[PDB]
Design a protein around this ligand. Structure first.
Ligand SMILES: Cc1cc2c3c(c1C)C(C)(C)CC=[N+]3c1c([nH]c(=O)[nH]c1=O)N2C[C@H](O)[C@H](O)[C@H](O)COP(=O)(O)O
Ligand SMILES: Cc1cc2c3c(c1C)C(C)(C)CC=[N+]3c1c([nH]c(=O)[nH]c1=O)N2C[C@H](O)[C@H](O)[C@H](O)COP(=O)(O)O
Ligand SMILES: [K+]
Ligand SMILES: [K+]
Ligand SMILES: [Mn+2]
Ligand SMILES: [Mn+2]
Lengths: 503, 502
């Protein structure tokens, strides 16, 4: 078998998961109407192998297979974050901390802008359809959740938009549903870069004609960085190239000047209008709900051209209850940028993480107690400093509760987090509300209350650092097996376990 | 005959053996740390309970240790089966069914204990008078690093009786060996051990309260010992109702208290509230040993002991979830919490204290039809709820009451945490109670200034959407079992193996 590069090539990503027994090719006919979604949910929820649906009801030979759960969790024996690790070309057993720290290290690497390759060598140019041959309604697009507002073709593809001055090309994920034979609609909302760039087209009189590309089965490093809140003005492609150690190979679109990854499974091209809008949503989302007939108009994308590979594969995320990509990518790439912001701001933080169990609503900051102690501060002042750094930023947008814990908590393990949360904060008294900051409109407690009108508040910083940890050493015993007892005793017990009779 | 694990501690051990849920460790184990460490490993992976048959320093009779008598075990055998066996219930009975059974038992005729012959009573097999009491000779475990001492009393039953003899209380409260004749332990309000002790102090007998301390009692008894049943009600009579028969008892050597005839060990003597000794710290239900944070507690003077051949000390070693301080303490508060909701007219279907929340969170499953009939608001309902629970003994340990609608399975922490984070606005949906009694054991209380006031720091958290207070609100829960029509869910489960899943 060839040497696999799953960060660079979507199909190598598929092969590496086969070789790890982490992918199940389903060859029997599966209905894109709910059945795909339901299988994906069953697989996410027990951390099982990713399904590749090779035989979809209503598919042509090329359009398409579906890959579900591309960044779901899997058994610990294989490395439970192996799928995320493979998007970055890392050892499958890498921890999430290491994943995060690698993304931060790649920020100081030389950015490698994309490299144009010949069209004759680019798999995404194998088939080219011009406008009259665009028939979105004939694609076997999944209907992912009951009461979704339409069929969501765009759950794990990359939108490419570029500023008018050509200086900033943004790659990002935002949901899109098929509206009719030629149109997609989806979220283009503040403070997302896709809206920022669309607005820069509006600012010069071209709100009804913004060029885009939508690419599926891009280099897995590209799709991951597509979900990451990197800074404005920074073209994702260049940071992808630093992650990969090589420039992303690209080709020009058929109908505009945008560059698309040469190994994409499927490329859609066209223009976006902010002034022609269509009812969109609802969509089963990151917090675990479909709220019925709660759609709202969004912009229309007119598809004008398409290109694709033989036997093309559509990667799909089907969000809901933890754990899926809206938790493993959205949350952790937020936590990555929250750590960066801590470094920028000088907060005494070791790590950051968004527990999956908290539906990417909670941001846990692991506080370096010595560094905290060096500030000579109080919980009230420190919680204010922290909330003020995070809750007015794009990075802090999805976050409604920042939880501060000492450096004895493994924040990446929710058994330790929930322990620290309930045992170390006094309800209400240890929580600081932030009334005036922008609410995340998707939080169900926000959207299903009068706060959906006012758009402000409902966020807090929760102090789970004991008062004495603001001042000095505080040595207590954590009462479990591994931490509670001397290393000699833990080993002795572990060595003799079978001999005792445990079977 | 038939084993009766509810009535006999040794039948309880036998049915755990019969289910491969008990490991008899026959090599030498040190009660210094090693027992407690083995126990922690067992609890934390829901493994078979250890029976330590050969403790360093033990005599032939005093003693073996059974750890984890109410720990959780594999779902295959019934994960709550140890608790079900304390009540003589099917081992696969769920904790909801356990709770509802305890509530049913409240309607049965109470059966007070019946005296049986001393000659037949196992707990009278060996009898020691005062001079032969040597508590330092017992292989008492040192359960956690930095414990204040060796806690003999973690899963036994204190017996105190009011001076007028109308109420005999059975309860568990920790106790450590002080010296060769004395134990010290918690005796705090609002617990009944303290309430009864105070009634003795009011008539000039604070320094001479009769007590008995019993180990390896009838498991139904040790379970009700951890339950906050009403004041004035003798546990023995409800334990009777649970068993379908009177607990068999015998009189103490040195006082008038009645002890279970099948007890493994009985210690007797006098409690003094006014002779105190440094007690603790102890690794307790919230998961911490706070080093050198002991406090003065009453002294128990042991004047007599009796015991069986080959006696067994049952032991609980608390800490991170899950152990008896969560499965018994929490669930038994929940049981009385549900009973209180019924008596107070709240529309509560079920109550539970998730193990993950270290018995600090009480979840109340609200009947939405009942809530809607109230025509109330969240603010009013949260007040009503906190007022009912936080001002009474049953609410003592609980710092946060979480209200959820009837679509949440409160026995499943995946649904509870999902509902918690998604359905309440941080701070705005929380109502603080400032003037209620704090649980002194909560680490956020003990390690703050609130340790000096003992007031406040409790809250009710509203996880019921605003619309659910008024009318129907049909939304889709985005998971496999709830999100999809039943026919599809069944179809996927039937075809799973054929897809290629293994
Ligand atoms: C991984 C992932 C990220 C989604 C996402 C999903 C996934 C799988 C979906 C498709 C399943 C459902 C909803 N999503 C949207 C989304 N951002 C957004 O504006 N609208 C969305 O609809 N995000 C987040 C978005 O990709 C991140 O906020 C990026 O930081 C945005 O890029 P930018 O920083 O360049 O604006
Ligand atoms: C099961 C159980 C219950 C403990 C307990 C433990 C266990 C295993 C320990 C021994 C491992 C550690 C600490 N415990 C104490 C405790 N109550 C108390 O006042 N002091 C305690 O030290 N409890 C709770 C007590 O048993 C319940 O609150 C009962 O409601 C008390 O009975 P009462 O209502 O008759 O007063
Ligand atoms: K991005
Ligand atoms: K009791
Ligand atoms: Mn961007
Ligand atoms: Mn009582």
């Amino acid at each position: 078998m060839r040497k696999l590069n799953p960060a660079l090539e979507f199909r190598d990503f598929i092969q590496v998961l086969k070789d790890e027994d982490d992918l199940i090719e389903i060859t029997e006919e599966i209905d894109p109407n709910l059945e795909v979604g339901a299988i994906m949910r069953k697989a996410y929820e027990s951390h099982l192998p990713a399904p590749l649906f090779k035989n979809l009801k209503g598919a042509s030979k090329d359009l398409f297979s579906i890959l579900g759960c591309p960044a779901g969790l899997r058994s610990k024996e294989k490395g439970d974050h192996g799928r995320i690790a493979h998007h970055l070309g890392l050892d499958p057993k890498t921890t999430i901390k290491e994943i995060i720290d690698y993304l931060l290290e790649c920020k100081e690497k030389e950015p490698l802008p994309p490299i144009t390759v010949p069209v004759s060598s680019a798999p995404c140019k194998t088939h080219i359809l011009s406008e009259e041959k665009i028939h979105l309604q004939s694609l076997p697009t999944p209907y992912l959740h009951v009461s979704d507002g339409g069929k969501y073709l765009q759950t794990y593809g990359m939108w490419i938009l570029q500023t008018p001055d050509k200086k900033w090309t943004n790659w990002s994920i935002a949901r899109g549903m098929v509206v009719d034979d030629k149109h997609i609609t989806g979220l283009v909302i503040k403070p997302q870069h896709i809206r920022q760039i669309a607005d820069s087209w509006a600012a010069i009189g071209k709100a009804n004609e913004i060029p885009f590309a939508l690419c599926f089965g891009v280099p897995p490093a590209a799709i991951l960085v597509s979900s990451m809140p990197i800074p404005e003005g920074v073209s994702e492609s260049d940071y992808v190239g630093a992650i990969l150690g090589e420039s992303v190979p690209v080709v020009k679109c058929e109908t505009n000047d945008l560059m698309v990854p040469a190994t994409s499974e499927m490329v859609f091209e066209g223009t976006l209008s902010l002034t022609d809008t269509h009812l969109e949503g609802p969509f089963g989302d990151m917090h675990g709900y479909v709220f019925k007939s709660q759609g709202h108009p969004c912009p229309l994308y007119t598809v004008k051209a398409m290109s694709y590979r033989d036997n093309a594969i559509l990667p799909v995320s089907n969000p809901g209850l933890c754990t899926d990509e809206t938790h493993t990518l959205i949350g952790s790439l937020v936590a990555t940028e929250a750590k960066e912001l801590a470094i920028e701001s000088g907060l005494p933080i070791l790590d950051a993480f968004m527990p999956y169990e908290a539906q990417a609503l909670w941001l846990i900051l692991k506080v370096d107690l010595k560094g905290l102690q060096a500030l000579k501060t109080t919980p009230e002042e420190f919680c204010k400093k922290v909330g003020d750094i995070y809750f007015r930023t794009k990075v802090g947008f999805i976050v409604h509760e920042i939880i501060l814990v000492a450096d004895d908590i493994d924040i990446f393990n929710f058994k330790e987090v929930i322990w620290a949360y309930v045992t170390r904060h006094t309800p209400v008294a240890d929580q600081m509300a932030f009334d005036d900051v922008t609410s995340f409109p998707l939080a169900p407690f926000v959207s299903q209350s009068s706060r959906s009108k006012t758009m402000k508040g409902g966020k807090c910083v929760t102090n789970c650092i004991f008062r004495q940890q603001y001042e000095r050493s505080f040595d207590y015993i954590t009462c479990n097996f591994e931490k509670g007892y001397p290393k000699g005793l833990v080993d002795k017990v572990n060595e003799n376990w079978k001999r005792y009779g445990y079977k």
